[PDB]
PDB file of C-alpha atoms in Angstrom:
ATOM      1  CA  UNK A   1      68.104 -18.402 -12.431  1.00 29.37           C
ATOM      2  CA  UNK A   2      67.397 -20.320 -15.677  1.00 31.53           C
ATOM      3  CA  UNK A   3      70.462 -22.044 -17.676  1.00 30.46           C
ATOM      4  CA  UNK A   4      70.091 -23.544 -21.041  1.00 30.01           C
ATOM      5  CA  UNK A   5      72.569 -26.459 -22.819  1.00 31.02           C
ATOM      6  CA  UNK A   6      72.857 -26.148 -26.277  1.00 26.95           C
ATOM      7  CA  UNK A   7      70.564 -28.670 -27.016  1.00 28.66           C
ATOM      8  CA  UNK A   8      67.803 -27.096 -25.461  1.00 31.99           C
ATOM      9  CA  UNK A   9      68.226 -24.007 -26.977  1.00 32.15           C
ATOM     10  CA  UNK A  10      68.466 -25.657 -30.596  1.00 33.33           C
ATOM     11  CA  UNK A  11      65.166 -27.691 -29.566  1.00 33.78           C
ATOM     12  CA  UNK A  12      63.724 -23.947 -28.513  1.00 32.74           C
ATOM     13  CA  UNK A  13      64.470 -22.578 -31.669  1.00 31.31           C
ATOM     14  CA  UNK A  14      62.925 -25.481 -33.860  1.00 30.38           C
ATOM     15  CA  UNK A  15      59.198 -25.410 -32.440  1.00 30.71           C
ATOM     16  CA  UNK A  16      58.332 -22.523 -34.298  1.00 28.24           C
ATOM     17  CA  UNK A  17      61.358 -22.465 -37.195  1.00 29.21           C
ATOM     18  CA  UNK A  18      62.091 -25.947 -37.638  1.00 30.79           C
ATOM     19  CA  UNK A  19      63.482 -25.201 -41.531  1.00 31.74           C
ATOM     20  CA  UNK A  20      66.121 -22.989 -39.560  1.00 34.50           C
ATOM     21  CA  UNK A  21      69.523 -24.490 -40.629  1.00 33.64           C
ATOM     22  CA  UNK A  22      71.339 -24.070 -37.289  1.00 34.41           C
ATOM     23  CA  UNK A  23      75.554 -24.751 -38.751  1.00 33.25           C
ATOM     24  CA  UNK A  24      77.343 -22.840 -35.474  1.00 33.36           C
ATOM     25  CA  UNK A  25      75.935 -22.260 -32.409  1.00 33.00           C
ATOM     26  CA  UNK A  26      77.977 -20.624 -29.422  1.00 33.46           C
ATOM     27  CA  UNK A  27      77.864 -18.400 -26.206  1.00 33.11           C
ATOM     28  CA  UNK A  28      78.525 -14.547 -26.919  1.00 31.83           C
ATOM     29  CA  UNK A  29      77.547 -12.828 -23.414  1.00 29.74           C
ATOM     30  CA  UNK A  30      75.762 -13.419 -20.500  1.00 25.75           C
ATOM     31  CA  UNK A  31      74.108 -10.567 -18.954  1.00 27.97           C
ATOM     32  CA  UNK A  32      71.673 -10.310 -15.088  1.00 25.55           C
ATOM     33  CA  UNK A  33      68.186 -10.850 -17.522  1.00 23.75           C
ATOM     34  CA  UNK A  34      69.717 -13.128 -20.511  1.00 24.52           C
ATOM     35  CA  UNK A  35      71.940 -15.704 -21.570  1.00 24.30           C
ATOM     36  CA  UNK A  36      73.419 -14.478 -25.339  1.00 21.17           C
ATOM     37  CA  UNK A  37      73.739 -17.173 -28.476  1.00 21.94           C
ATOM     38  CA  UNK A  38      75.317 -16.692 -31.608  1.00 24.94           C
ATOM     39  CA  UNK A  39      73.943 -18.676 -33.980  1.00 24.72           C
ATOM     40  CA  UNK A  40      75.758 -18.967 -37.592  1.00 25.29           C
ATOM     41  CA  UNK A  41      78.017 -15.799 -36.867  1.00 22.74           C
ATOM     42  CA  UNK A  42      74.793 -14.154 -37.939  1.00 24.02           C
ATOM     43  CA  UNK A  43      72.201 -13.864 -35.674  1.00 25.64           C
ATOM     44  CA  UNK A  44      72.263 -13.660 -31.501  1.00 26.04           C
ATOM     45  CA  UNK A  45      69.633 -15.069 -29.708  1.00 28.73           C
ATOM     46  CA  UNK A  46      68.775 -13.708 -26.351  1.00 28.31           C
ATOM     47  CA  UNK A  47      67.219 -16.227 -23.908  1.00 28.00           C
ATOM     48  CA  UNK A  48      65.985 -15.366 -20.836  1.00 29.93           C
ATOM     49  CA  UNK A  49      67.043 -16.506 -16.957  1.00 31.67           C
ATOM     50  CA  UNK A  50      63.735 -15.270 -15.497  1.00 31.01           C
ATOM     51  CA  UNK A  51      60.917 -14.066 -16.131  1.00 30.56           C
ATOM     52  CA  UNK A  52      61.523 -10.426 -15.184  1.00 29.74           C
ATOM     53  CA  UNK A  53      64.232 -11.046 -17.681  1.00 30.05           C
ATOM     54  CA  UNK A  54      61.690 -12.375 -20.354  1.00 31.60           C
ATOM     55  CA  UNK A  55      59.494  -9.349 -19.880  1.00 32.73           C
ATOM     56  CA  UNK A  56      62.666  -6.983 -20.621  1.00 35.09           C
ATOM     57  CA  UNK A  57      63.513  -9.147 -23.978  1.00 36.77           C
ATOM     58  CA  UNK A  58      59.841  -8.663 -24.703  1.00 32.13           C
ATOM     59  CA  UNK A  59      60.083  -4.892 -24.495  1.00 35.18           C
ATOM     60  CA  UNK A  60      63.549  -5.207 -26.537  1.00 34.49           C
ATOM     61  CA  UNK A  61      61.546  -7.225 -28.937  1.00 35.06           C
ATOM     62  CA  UNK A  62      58.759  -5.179 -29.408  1.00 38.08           C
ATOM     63  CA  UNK A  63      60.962  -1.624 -29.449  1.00 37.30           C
ATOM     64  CA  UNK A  64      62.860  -2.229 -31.706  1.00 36.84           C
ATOM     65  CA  UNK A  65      60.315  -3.478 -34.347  1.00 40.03           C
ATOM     66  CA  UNK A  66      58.762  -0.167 -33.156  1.00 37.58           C
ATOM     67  CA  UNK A  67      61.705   2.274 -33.899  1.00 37.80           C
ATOM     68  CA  UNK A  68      63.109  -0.080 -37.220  1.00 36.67           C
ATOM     69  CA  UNK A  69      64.975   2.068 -39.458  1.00 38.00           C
ATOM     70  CA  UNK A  70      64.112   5.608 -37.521  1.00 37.03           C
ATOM     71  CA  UNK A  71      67.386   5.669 -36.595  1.00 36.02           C
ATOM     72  CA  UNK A  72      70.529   6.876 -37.996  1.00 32.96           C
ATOM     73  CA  UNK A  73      72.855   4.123 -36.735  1.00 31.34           C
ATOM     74  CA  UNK A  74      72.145   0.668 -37.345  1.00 31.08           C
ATOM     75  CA  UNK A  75      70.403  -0.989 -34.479  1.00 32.85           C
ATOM     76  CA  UNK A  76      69.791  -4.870 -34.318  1.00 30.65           C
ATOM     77  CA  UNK A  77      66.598  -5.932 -36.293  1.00 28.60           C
ATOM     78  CA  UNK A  78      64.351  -8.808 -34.787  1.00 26.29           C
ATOM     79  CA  UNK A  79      64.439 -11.946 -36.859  1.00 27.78           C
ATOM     80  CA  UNK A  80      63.179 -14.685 -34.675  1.00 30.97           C
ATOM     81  CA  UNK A  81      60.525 -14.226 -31.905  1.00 35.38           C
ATOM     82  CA  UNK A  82      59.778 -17.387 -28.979  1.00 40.08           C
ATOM     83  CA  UNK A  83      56.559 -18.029 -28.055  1.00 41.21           C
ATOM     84  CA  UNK A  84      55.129 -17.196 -24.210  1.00 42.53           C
ATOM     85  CA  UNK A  85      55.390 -20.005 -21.540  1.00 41.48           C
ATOM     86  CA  UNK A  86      54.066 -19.673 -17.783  1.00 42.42           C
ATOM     87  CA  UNK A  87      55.520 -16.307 -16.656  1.00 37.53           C
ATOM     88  CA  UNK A  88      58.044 -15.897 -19.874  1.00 39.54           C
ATOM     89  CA  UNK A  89      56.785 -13.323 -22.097  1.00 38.24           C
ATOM     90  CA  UNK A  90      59.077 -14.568 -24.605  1.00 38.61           C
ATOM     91  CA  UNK A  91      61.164 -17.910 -24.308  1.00 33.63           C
ATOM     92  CA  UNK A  92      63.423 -16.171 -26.672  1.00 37.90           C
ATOM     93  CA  UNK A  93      64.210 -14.028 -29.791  1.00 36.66           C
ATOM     94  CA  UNK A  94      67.001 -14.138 -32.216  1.00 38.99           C
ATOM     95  CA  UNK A  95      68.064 -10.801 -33.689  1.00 39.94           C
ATOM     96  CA  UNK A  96      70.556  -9.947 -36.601  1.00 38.42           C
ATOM     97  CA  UNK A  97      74.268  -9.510 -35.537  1.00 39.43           C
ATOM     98  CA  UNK A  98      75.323  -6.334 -36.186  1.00 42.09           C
ATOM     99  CA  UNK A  99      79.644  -5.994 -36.885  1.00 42.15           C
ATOM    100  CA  UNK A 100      81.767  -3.719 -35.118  1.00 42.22           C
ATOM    101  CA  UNK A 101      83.698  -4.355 -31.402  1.00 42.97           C
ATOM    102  CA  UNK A 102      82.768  -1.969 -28.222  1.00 44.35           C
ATOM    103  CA  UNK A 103      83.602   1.491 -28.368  1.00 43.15           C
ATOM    104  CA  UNK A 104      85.829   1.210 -25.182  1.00 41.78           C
ATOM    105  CA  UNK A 105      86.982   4.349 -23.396  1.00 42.62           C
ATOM    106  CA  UNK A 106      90.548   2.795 -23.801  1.00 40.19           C
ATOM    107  CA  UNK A 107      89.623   2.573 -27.467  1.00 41.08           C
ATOM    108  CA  UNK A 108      88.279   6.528 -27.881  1.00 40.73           C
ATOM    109  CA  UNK A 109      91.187   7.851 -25.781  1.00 41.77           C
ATOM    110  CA  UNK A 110      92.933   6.544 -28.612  1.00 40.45           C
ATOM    111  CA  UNK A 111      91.536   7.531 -31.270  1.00 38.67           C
ATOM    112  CA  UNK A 112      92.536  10.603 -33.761  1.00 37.39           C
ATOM    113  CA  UNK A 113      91.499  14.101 -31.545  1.00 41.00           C
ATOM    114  CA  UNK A 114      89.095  14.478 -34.874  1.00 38.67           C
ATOM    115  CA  UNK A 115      87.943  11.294 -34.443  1.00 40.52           C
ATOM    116  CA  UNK A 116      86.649  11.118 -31.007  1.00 36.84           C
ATOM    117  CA  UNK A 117      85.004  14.524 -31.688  1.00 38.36           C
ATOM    118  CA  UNK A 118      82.626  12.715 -34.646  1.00 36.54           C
ATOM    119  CA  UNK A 119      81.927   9.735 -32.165  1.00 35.01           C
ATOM    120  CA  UNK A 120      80.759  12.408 -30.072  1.00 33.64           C
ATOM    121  CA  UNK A 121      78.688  14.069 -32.857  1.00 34.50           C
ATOM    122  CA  UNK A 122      77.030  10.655 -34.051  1.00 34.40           C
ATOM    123  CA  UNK A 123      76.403   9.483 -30.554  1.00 33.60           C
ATOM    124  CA  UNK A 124      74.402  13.155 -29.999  1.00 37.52           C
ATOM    125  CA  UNK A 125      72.636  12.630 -33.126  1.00 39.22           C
ATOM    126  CA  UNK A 126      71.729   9.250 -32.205  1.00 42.18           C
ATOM    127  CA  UNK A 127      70.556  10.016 -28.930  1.00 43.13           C
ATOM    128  CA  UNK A 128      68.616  13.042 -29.951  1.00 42.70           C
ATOM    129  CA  UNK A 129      66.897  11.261 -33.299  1.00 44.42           C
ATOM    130  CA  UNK A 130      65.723   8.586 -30.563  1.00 45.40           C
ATOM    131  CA  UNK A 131      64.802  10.921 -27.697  1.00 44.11           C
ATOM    132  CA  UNK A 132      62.464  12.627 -30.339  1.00 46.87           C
ATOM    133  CA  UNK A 133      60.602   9.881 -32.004  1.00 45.77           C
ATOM    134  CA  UNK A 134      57.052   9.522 -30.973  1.00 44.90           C
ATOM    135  CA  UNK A 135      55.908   8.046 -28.080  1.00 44.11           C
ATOM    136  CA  UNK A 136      51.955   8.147 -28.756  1.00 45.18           C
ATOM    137  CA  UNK A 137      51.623   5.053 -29.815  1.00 44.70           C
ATOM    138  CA  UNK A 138      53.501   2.676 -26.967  1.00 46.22           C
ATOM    139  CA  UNK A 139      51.435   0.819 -23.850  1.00 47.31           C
ATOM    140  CA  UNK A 140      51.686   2.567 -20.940  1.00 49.43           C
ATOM    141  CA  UNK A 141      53.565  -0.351 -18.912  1.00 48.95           C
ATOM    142  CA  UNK A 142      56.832   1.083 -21.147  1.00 49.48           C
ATOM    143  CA  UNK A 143      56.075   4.433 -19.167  1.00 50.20           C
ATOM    144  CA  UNK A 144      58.761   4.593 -16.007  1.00 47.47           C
ATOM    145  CA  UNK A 145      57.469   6.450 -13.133  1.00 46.99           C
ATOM    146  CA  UNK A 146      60.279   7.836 -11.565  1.00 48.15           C
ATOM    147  CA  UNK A 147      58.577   8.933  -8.156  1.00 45.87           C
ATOM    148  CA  UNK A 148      56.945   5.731  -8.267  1.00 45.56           C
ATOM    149  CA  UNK A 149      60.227   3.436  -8.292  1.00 46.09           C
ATOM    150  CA  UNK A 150      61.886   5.307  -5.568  1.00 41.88           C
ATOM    151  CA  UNK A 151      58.635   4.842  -3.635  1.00 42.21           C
ATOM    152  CA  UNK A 152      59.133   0.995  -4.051  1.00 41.18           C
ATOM    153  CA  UNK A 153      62.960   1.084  -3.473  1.00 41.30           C
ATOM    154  CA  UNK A 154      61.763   3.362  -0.240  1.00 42.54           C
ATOM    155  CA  UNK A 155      59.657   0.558   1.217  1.00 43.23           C
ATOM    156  CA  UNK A 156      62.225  -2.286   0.128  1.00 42.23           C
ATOM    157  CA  UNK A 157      65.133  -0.538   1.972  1.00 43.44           C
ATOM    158  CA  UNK A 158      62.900   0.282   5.203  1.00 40.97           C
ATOM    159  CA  UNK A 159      62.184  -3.630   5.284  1.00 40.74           C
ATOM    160  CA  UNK A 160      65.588  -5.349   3.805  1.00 43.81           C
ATOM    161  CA  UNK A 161      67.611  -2.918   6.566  1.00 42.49           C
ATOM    162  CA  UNK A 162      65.749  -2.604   9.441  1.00 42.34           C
ATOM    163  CA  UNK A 163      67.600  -5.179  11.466  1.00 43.28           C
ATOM    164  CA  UNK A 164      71.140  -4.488   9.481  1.00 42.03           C
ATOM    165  CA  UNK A 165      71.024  -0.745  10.556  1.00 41.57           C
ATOM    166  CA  UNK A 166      71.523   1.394  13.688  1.00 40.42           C
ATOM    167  CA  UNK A 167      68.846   4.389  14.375  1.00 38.17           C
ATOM    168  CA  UNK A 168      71.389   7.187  12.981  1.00 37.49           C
ATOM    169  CA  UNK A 169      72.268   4.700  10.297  1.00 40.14           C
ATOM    170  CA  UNK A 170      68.521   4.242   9.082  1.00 39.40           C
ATOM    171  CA  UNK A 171      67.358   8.165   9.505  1.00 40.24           C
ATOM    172  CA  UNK A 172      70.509   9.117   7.188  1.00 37.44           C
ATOM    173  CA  UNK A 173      69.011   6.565   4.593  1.00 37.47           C
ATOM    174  CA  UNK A 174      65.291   8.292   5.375  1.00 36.71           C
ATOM    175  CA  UNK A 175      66.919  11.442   4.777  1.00 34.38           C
ATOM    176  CA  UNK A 176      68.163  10.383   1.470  1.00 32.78           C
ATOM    177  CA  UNK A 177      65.275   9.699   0.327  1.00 32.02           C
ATOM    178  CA  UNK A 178      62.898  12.282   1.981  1.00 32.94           C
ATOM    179  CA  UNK A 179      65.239  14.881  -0.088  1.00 29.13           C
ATOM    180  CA  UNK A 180      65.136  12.476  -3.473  1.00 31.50           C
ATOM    181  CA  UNK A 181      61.261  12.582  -3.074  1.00 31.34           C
ATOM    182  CA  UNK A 182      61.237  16.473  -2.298  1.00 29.02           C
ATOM    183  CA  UNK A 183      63.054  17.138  -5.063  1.00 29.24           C
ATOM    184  CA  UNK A 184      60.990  17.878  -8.784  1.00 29.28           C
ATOM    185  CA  UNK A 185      64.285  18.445 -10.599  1.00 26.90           C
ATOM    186  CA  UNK A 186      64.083  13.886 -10.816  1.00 27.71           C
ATOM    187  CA  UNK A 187      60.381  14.031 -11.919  1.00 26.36           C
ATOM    188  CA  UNK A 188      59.638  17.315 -13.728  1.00 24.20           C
ATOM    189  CA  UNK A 189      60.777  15.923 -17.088  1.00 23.23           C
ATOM    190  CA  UNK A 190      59.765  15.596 -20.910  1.00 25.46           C
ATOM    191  CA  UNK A 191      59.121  11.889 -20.828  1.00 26.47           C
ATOM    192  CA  UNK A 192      61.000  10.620 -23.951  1.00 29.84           C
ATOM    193  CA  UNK A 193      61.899   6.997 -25.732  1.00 26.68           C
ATOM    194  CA  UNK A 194      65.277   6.337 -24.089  1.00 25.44           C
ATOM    195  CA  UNK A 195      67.991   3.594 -24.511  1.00 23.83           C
ATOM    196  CA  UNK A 196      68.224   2.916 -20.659  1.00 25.10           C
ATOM    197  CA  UNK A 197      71.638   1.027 -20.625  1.00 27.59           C
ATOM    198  CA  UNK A 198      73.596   4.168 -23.221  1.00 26.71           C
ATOM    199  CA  UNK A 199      76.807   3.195 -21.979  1.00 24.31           C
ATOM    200  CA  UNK A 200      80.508   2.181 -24.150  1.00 23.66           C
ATOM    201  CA  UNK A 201      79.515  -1.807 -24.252  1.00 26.15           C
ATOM    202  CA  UNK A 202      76.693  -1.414 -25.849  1.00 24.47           C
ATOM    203  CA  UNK A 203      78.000   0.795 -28.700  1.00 26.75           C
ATOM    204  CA  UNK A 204      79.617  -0.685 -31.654  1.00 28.49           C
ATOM    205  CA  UNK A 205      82.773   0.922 -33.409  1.00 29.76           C
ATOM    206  CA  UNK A 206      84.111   0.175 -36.688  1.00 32.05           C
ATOM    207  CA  UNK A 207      87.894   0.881 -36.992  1.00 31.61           C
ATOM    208  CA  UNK A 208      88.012   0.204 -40.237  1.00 34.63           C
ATOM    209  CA  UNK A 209      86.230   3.992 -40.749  1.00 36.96           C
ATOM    210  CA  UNK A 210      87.011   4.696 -36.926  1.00 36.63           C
ATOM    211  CA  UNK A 211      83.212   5.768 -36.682  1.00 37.79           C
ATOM    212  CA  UNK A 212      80.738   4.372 -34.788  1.00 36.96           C
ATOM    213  CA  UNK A 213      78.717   1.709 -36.676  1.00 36.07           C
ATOM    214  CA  UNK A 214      75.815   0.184 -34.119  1.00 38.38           C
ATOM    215  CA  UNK A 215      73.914   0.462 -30.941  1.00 36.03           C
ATOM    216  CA  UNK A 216      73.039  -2.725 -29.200  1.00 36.00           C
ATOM    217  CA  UNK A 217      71.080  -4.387 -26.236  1.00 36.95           C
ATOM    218  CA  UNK A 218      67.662  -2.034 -25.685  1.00 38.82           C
ATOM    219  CA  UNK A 219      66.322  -4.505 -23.111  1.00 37.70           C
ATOM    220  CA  UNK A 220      66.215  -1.573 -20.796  1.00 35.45           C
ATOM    221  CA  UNK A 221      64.543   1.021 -22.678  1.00 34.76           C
ATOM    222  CA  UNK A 222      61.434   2.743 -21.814  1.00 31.17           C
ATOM    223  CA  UNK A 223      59.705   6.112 -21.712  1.00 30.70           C
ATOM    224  CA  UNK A 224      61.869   7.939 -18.890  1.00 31.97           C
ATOM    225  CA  UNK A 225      64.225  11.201 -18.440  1.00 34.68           C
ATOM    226  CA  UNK A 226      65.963  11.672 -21.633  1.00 36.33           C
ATOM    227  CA  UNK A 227      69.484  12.593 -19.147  1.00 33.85           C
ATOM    228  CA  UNK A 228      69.292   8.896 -18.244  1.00 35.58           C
ATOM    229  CA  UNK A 229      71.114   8.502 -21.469  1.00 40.61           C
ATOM    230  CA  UNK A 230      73.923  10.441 -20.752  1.00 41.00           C
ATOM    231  CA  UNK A 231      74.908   9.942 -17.042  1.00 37.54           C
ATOM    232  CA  UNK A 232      75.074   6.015 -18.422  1.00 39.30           C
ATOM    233  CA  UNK A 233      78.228   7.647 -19.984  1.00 40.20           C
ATOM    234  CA  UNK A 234      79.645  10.351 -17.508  1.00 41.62           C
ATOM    235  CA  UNK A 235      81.498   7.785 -15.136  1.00 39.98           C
ATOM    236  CA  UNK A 236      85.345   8.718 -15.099  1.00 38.72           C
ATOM    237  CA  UNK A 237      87.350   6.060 -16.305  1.00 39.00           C
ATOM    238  CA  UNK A 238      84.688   3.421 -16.238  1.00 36.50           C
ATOM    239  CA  UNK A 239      82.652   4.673 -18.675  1.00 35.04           C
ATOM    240  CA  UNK A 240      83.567   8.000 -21.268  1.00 34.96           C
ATOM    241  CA  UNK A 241      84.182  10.746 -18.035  1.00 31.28           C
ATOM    242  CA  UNK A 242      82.298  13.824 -18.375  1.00 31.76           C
ATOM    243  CA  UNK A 243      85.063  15.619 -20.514  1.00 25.86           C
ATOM    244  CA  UNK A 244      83.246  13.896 -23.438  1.00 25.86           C
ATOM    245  CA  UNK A 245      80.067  13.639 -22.793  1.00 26.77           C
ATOM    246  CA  UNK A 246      80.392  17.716 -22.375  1.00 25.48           C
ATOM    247  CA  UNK A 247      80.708  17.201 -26.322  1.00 25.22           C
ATOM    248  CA  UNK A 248      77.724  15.400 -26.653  1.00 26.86           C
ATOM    249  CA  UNK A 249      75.773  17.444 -24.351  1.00 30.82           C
ATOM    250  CA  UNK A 250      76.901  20.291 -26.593  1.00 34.68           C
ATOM    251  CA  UNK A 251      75.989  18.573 -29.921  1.00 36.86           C
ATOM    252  CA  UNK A 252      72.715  17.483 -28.795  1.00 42.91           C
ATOM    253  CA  UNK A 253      71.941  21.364 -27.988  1.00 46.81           C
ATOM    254  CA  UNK A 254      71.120  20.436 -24.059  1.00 44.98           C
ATOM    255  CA  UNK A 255      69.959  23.670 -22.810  1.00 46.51           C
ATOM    256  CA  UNK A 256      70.752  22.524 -19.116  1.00 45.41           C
ATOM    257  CA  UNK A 257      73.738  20.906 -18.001  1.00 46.47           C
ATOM    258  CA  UNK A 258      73.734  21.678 -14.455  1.00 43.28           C
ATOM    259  CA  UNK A 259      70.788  19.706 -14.013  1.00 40.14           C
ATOM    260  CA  UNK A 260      72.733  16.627 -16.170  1.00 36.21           C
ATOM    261  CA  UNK A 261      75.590  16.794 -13.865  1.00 39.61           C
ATOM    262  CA  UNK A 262      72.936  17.007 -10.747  1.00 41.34           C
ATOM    263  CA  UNK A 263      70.979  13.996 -11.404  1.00 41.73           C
ATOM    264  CA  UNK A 264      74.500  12.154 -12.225  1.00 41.15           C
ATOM    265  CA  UNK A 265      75.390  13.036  -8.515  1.00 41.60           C
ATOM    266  CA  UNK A 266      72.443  11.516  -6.973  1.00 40.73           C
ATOM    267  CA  UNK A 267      72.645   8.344  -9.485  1.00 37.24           C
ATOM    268  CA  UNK A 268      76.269   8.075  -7.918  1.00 37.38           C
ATOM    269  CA  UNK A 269      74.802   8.463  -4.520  1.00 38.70           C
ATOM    270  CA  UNK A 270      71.938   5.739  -5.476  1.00 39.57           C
ATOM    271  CA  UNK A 271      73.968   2.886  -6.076  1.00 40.55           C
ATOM    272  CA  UNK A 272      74.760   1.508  -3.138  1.00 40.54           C
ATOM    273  CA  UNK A 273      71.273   1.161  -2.600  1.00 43.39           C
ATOM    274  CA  UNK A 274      70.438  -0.384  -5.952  1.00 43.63           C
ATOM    275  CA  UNK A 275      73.118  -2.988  -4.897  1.00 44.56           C
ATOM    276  CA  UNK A 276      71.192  -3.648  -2.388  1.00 45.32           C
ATOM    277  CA  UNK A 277      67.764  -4.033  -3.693  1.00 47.21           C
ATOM    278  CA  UNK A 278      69.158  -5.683  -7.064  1.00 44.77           C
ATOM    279  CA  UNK A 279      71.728  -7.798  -4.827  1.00 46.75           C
ATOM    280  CA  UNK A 280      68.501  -9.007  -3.100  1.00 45.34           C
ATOM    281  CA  UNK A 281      65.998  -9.817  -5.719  1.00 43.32           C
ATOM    282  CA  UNK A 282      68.989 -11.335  -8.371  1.00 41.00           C
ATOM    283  CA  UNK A 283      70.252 -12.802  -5.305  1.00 42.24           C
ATOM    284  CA  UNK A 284      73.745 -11.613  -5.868  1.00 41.60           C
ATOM    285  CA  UNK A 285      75.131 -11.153  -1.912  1.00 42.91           C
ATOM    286  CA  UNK A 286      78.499  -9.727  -3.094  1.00 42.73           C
ATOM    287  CA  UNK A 287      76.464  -6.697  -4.298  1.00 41.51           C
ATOM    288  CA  UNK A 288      74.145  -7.205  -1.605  1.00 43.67           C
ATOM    289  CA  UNK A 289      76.691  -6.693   0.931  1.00 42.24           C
ATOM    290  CA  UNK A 290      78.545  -4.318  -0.796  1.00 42.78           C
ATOM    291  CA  UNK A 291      75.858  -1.753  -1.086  1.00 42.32           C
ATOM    292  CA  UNK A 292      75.115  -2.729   2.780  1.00 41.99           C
ATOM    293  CA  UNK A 293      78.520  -1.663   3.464  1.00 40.21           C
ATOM    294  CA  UNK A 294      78.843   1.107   1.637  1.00 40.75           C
ATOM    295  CA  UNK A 295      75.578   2.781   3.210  1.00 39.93           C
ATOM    296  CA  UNK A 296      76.873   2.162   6.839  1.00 41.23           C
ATOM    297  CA  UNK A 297      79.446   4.906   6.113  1.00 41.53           C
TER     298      UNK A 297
END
């Protein structure tokens, strides 16, 4: 896990834009794959704290150059772009700062009835003018192969648990996924762009109009199950709760809810064991253990 003073990052920053005028320069976020900068209240620069992180920003970088003004909510443009190093894709890139504060579900319960209902109409219009651009043209390292990953997270749980669980304890697990893998409802889909990480933090509200005024942080997207991007959401009093999404779902003309609401119940299921695997490989033991714990009940 890579860390950064200020000094280095200004030094970063001046290699390849040295007539960059650099006046304020301060911390706005820390995420699991980047440590956040804004630099003159105008830009924020994303470095990255590993190179799995790196590749992400690189992907950020180079979708949202991609999908530049297709969208009809303003999305952060890419201003400044690091060079490679080693295993870092990208040492960095510096993107415009887009205004508004997090549409939090504190924040829409308490908006105007009327109101929430637009949020709910731009956020279906959003998600179905980005789930319908075209995909032709990416690499086909952006495409996510669902059956794939749960084969990998299948042979890191079998190895990460085989001392930590009990024989009824691991076939349970097996089950799980024997049942994931048997079931084409996860990988029978219309591969689409997707935003990856569509949940209330990364969606910027303007309560000035009370409308929603940005989407933010696409360092998760790829080509994957256009539902992904509304589960993100579903999560009761965490995230929006399914009572609104409903409204998107219904906006966005989803012909098939039931399946929504299905692969939402085996995300929720999934978890713990994404804990585990993430809690291993970020080296975070509290979510390591957590997940752990969770799956020996």
């Amino acid at each position: 896990m890579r860390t950064y003073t200020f000094d280095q990052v200004e030094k970063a920053i001046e290699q390849l834009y040295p007539d960059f005028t650099i006046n304020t320069i301060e911390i706005s976020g820390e995420g699991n794959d980047c440590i956040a900068y804004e630099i003159n209240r105008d830009f924020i620069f994303k470095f990255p704290k590993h190179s799995r992180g790196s590749t992400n920003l690189f992907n950020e970088v180079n979708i949202l150059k991609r999908i530049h003004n297709k969208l009809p909510l303003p999305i952060p443009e890419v201003v400044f772009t690091g060079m490679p190093s080693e295993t870092y894709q990208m040492s960095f890139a510096g993107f415009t700062k887009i205004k508004g504060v997090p549409l939090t579900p504190l924040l829409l319960n308490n908006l105007p009835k009327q109101s929430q209902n637009q949020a709910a109409k731009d956020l279906a219009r959003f998600l179905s003018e980005l789930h319908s651009i075209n995909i032709s043209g990416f690499k086909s390292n952006l495409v996510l192969d669902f059956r794939e990953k749960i084969n990998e997270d299948n042979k890191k749980i079998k190895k990460l648990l085989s001392r930590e669980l009990k024989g009824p304890q691991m076939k349970k697990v097996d089950d799980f996924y024997r049942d994931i893998l048997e079931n084409e409802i996860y990988f029978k889909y219309y591969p689409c762009l997707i935003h990856n990480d569509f949940s209330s933090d990364h969606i910027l509200f303007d309560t000035e109009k009370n409308t929603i005024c940005g989407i933010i942080d696409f360092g998760d997207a790829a080509i994957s199950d256009p539902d992904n991007d509304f589960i993100s959401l579903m999560e009761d009093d965490e995230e929006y709760g399914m009572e609104f999404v409903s409204k998107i779902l219904n906006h966005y003309k989803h012909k098939d809810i039931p399946t929504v609401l299905e692969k939402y119940r085996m995300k929720e299921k999934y978890w713990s064991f994404e804990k585990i695997i993430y809690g291993k490989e970020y080296g975070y033991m509290d979510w390591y253990e957590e997940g752990l714990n969770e799956i020996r009940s």
